[PDB]
């Protein structure tokens, strides 16, 4: 899944992508299902807010996957750890 | 007149009763003052008991029923027979020995 | 709107949309019986062309509507009791209803093989 929530706008077409827990599945529209199933994503939730233009929905979705919040940068910026709770809980990354 | 009686519930050929505290002159299945317990007339059988003995499941709040009998509640003939078995009242009927 | 404008009742129900078959939607009825005041023909609008078999029916509620007769060939005429259902003829203006083929006086298409339930046609029973 993606890191956190992302919202990108391309000319009146807003897409909102949300990270979901494991086993949630690709509960997204048809064109987002193809992009996620091709990039390797398996758990996501999407929502078109303003416009469902076929072209701008793919440009906004692709741009959202490239502008995810990087926890490594957010930590160095604020001077505080952003601990991966799910990783400490199971002692490692459970893919 | 308060009465300790039974409210017939369930389905066709599947009787199930609620022991209730209700005024005599009210509908049988109207919401009573209290639900003292339940009563299933059809006798059941233990799962892994091949002896053939049967039993009847009856849930009753004896502490709450004793208070109503103490203040002057009148149980019906059916509830009287049940309250006499647990040992609260004396039986109204007995098998003639002669 | 501001919270004050909403508190005073700015939000009102959206203006109603007219139903496809108002004579049936107004009273929640799926169908209505009626007598045929006239049985004739209606002409479609610009794009399509032909002759659409329609009937002027006087519903049991008093309203006079124009119903479309589905299928090839019909049996009803003036003073004929027929059952009316919803659904409109898209290319015909004013024809906002259909007639049921297995209705009281209206008969089902006799030489019908496909979609018999839509035209009130009994099975040929040729096998039995």
């Amino acid at each position: 899944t993606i890191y956190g929530e992302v919202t990108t706008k391309v000319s009146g077409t807003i897409v909102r992508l949300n990270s979901r827990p494991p086993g949630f599945g690709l509960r997204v529209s048809h064109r987002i299902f193809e992009m996620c199933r091709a990039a390797g994503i398996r758990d996501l939730s999407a929502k078109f807010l303003r416009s469902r233009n076929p072209m701008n929905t793919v440009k906004a979705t692709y741009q959202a996957l490239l502008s995810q919040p990087n926890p490594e940068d957010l930590a160095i910026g604020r001077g505080k750890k952003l601990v991966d709770v799910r990783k400490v809980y199971y002692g490692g990354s459970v893919y | 007149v308060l009465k300790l009686r039974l409210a017939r519930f369930g389905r066709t050929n599947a009787p199930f009763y609620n022991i209730v505290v209700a005024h005599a002159r009210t509908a049988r299945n109207s919401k009573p003052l209290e639900v003292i317990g339940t009563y299933d007339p059809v006798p059941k059988k233990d799962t892994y008991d091949t002896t053939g003995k049967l039993h009847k499941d009856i849930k009753l709040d004896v502490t709450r029923a004793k208070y109503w009998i103490g203040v002057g509640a009148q149980p019906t003939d059916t509830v009287w027979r049940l309250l006499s078995l647990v040992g609260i009242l004396d039986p109204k009927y007995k098998k003639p020995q002669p | 709107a501001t919270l004050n404008q909403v508190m005073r009742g700015c939000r009102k129900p959206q203006r109603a949309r007219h139903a496809v078959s108002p004579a049936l939607s107004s009273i929640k009825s799926p169908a209505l019986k009626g007598v045929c005041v006239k049985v004739g023909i209606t002409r479609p609008k610009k794009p399509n062309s032909g002759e659409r078999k329609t009937a002027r029916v006087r519903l049991s509620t008093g309203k006079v509507i124009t119903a479309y007769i589905p299928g090839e060939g019909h049996n009803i005429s003036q003073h004929s009791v027929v059952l009316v259902r919803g659904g409109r003829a898209q290319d015909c203006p004013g024809v906002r209803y259909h007639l049921v083929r297995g209705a009281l006086d209206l008969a089902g298409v006799a030489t019908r093989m496909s979609s018999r339930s839509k035209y009130g046609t009994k099975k040929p029973k040729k096998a039995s």
């Binding site: - | 009573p32 003052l33 209290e34 639900v35 799962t47 892994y48 008991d49 709450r64 | -």
Partner: protein, 60 residues
């Protein structure tokens, strides 16, 4: 317990489950029951639970 638990019953060997190992979602039960009335006041000790109360309101 008059009849011993046979080896067919699931209770023959009791193996309790660890905590937070199931997430069964019980369905919402419809209907209600009459709330039994209160017999005592919420503060103080009433005179109904004294020593000689019954013998006073129900003499022989």
């Amino acid at each position: 317990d008059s009849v011993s638990i046979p080896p067919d019953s699931p209770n023959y060997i009791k193996v309790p489950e660890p905590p937070q190992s199931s997430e069964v979602r019980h369905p919402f039960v419809k209907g209600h029951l009459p709330i039994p009335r209160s017999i005592f006041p919420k503060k103080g000790v009433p005179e109904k639970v004294q020593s000689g109360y019954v013998n006073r309101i129900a003499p022989k």
